[PDB]
Structure 1
Amino acid sequence: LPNIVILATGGTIGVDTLINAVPEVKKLANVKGEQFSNMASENMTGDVVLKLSQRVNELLARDDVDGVVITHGTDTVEESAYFLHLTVKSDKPVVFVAAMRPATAISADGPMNLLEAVRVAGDKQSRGRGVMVVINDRIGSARYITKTNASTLDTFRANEEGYLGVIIGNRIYYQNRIDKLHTTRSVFDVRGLTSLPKVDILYGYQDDPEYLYDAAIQHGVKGIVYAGMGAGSVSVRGIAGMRKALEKGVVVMRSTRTGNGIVPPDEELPGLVSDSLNPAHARILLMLALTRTSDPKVIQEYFHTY
């Protein structure tokens, strides 16, 4: 049986309580619980996610550890997952798991989600696939998966990219391998860091205010992710705001509020384009990109390859 470490951070899903709640896991692998933190995912911060990554990195460096399952809240799991997706230098399975219903709710999804997460983490076939998010019988890539519904069990989906695999009848069915750089082939090393560049997200909508750009600039942001209307389209007020941000060394990354798709290059508009990264994912990559460079051309390439 593979050795799996379950790191708890909090979420609707103690760590031992969860382990004892589902004895079935012992039959899938030798599990050791570790309470990393205990907070709702809406409060997870880059600084803490950074420590999480460094901790997972040292655990995976150990010969006595074959994989890691991280319990996390559903609200921002896509952000934490994508962060480790880009910073964990190992092929060993790193599986995030969450639950849309509280552990006390009728028909709670937590028990089964955890069981599936451990099976995925302990399977030899799961190595070298990037960070994964397991829930509701699905295995989603950290780079594509996102919470699409505020309250449903089947909320996590990658509409255009699908799932890396699924777990049915206690068997794992791998469907895709992501065609992007990650983990062991990522240039983003943060083990020598304690914090990341500040990046905020501004929404795009009719009558969007120019002053929010001023406010962000004034508070020291090093980057601004724009959840734009359509394909990163910008109103005259957003353009004026982005212009001021650029004049002050702030990197502007145009994403989309739509939820899916490609924001294509447009030399007629200011800032960079987010490829298929949604706002939450784009912020994470921009923060990491800024730890290595400020060159817009280099940053743009990162977004087309990560």
Structure 2
Amino acid sequence: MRILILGMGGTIASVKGERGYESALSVSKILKLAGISAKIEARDLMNVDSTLIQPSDWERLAKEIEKEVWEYDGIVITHGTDTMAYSASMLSFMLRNPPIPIVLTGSMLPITEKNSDAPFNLRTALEFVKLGIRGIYIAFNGKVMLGVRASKIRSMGFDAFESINYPNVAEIKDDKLRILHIPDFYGDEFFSDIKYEPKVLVIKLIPGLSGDIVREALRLGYKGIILEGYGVGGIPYRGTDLFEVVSSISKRIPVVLTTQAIYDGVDLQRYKVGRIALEAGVIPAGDMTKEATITKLMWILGHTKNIEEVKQLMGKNITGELTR
């Protein structure tokens, strides 16, 4: 059992510097502070403060994993929690059909604070990686979730991540990691497509919102747009020019409609506003997580800019991110 642990930074690598928490620990030091020591090779790719991860970092990470995926039985990645779901999802699209278990983890409190969750999360990730279930996951607060289905719903409590609209892959019961179900949508060939278009915009739909910002986003050069709507989905065509503007922008760049809600997702077929929105050209996000949605659109935009192709790829279940 040979395991590789890559560091990305985050709270798990943070410490109080009188100026609040700030990334300061290397991966090897994180492991020792946690009291962990199977052959484990620790490596620092970078040590970025939480909230500072950028798309560029996904590329570096993907390339690193790509050249080690055949030299290890499992890979664990210590990451900041704020953007963990983004990284997990983007990696899932870039590294399809991984041969080994790749699991991202982190913590809500640095290893230096009491009652820290870091050791527990490190332990759980390592425990899961020894089970041999390939794919990309997130291990947090005693659970292992498929990365592309994970979302951060809490900003402080220990149970910050939840598998949305999909069941947990593994859980701790009677002090042991029990497998609940094995994700089975992986093919044979492992291919890497480390290509994407980072410039997309995510706007929340609020009552009274105008389309001027959408028109301006196209002019600024955004290659795609995601609107966070209400309930099951629909664009307002009353009192504002939002609808007429979207009907036009959606023919030049993809305009994806997602939900402000956390559970259940979108279904543009349900209400009249939804059907009208579907006519304007908005692309449905199904039951995908916000993170999977955003990263998928970026990934897709890195391969094509044809609205029709984007619409089809968006509604396609590429790596278990959506239920059809």
Return the TM-score normalized by structure 2: 0.83
Q: What does residue 140 of structure 2 align with?
A: 135
RMSD: 2.2
Counterpart of 1:10? 9
Look up the match of 2:45: 36
Alpha-carbon spacing, 1:212–1:186, altered in 2? closer, same or farther (3 Å):
farther
Q: Which residue of 2 aligns with 1:98?
A: 106
Cα distance, 1:183 vs structure 2: 8.0
Tell me how far apart the structure 2 counterparts of residues 183 and 145 of structure 1 sit (CA, whole Å): 22
Q: How do residues 113-152 of structure 1 correspond to structure 2 at under 5 angstroms? A: 113-124=121-132, 126-127=133-134, 130-152=135-157
Matched letter for residue 31 of structure 2: I
Which residue identity lines up with residue 243 of structure 2 in the other structure? I
Structure with the largest fraction of helix: 1
- For structure 2, which runs of at least 5 residues remain unmatched after alignment? 13-25, 270-274, 319-324
Cα distance, 1:297 vs. partner?
A: 4.0
- Alignment partner, residue 231 of structure 2: 230
- Percent identity over the alignment is 21
Deviation at 1:274, TM superposition (A): 0.3
Structure 2 equivalent of residue 299 of structure 1? 310
Greater Rg by CA: 2
Deviations 1:51-103 (A, max 9, x none): 211111111033xx111100011111011001111222422010000101122
Residue in structure 1 matched with residue 65 of structure 2 by the alignment: 56
Say which SS state the counterpart of residue 4 (structure 1) adopts. Answer: strand
Hey, what's the Cα distance between the residues in 1 that align with 2:246 and 2:183? 32
**2:79 and 2:106 in contact (8 A); partners too:** yes
- Counterparts of 1:133 and 1:97 in 2: how far apart (Å)? 6
Q: Which residue of 2 aligns with 1:257?
A: 260
TM-score, scaled to structure 1: 0.87
Equivalent residues of 1:214, 1:244 under 8 A apart:
no
| CA drift at 1:105 | 1.8
Structure 2 residue identity aligned to 1:31:
I
Over 3 Å counting, the alpha-carbon distance change for 1:173 and 1:300 in structure 2 is farther
Separation in structure 1 between the aligned mates of residue 183 and residue 267 of structure 2, nearest angstrom: 20
Distance (Å, rounded) in 1 between the aligned partners of 2:130 and 2:119 = 17
Native 8 Å contact 1:139 1:164 kept in 2: yes
Greater displacement, 37-46 / 293-302: 293-302
Change (3 A) 1:101 1:183: farther
Q: 2:54 aligns with which of 45, 54, 57?
A: 45
Residues in 2 aligned to 1:156 and 1:78: alpha-carbon distance in whole angstroms: 9
- After superposition, the Cα gap between the structure-2 partners of 1:296 and 1:160, relative to the gap in structure 1 and judged at 3 Å, is same
Q: Which position in structure 1 is the counterpart of 2:94?
A: 87
Q: Contact 2:229/2:258 (CA < 8 Å) preserved in 1?
A: yes
Offset at residue 169 of structure 1 (A):
4.4
From 75, 85, 96, the equivalent of 1:78 is: 85
Structure 1 segments unaligned to the other structure (5+ residues): none
Distance in 2 between the 1:257 and 1:186 partners? 34
Matched with 2:116 is 108
Tell me the secondary structure at the aligned position of residue 242 of structure 1. Answer: helix
The answer as to whether partners of 1:257 and 1:278 remain within 8 angstroms in 2 is no
1:215 and 2:216 are equivalent in the alignment: yes
Return the alpha-carbon distance in structure 2 between the equivalents of residues 257 and 74 of structure 1: 21
2: CA distance, partners of 1:135 / 1:215: 39
Q: Which structure 2 residues correspond to residues 154-193 of structure 1 after superposition, within 5 A?
A: 154-178=159-183, 181=185, 189-191=192-194, 193=195
Task: Confirm or deny: 8 A CA contact 1:88 1:183 kept in the other structure.
Answer: no
Rounded Cα–Cα distance in structure 1 between residues aligned with 2:188 and 2:57: 22
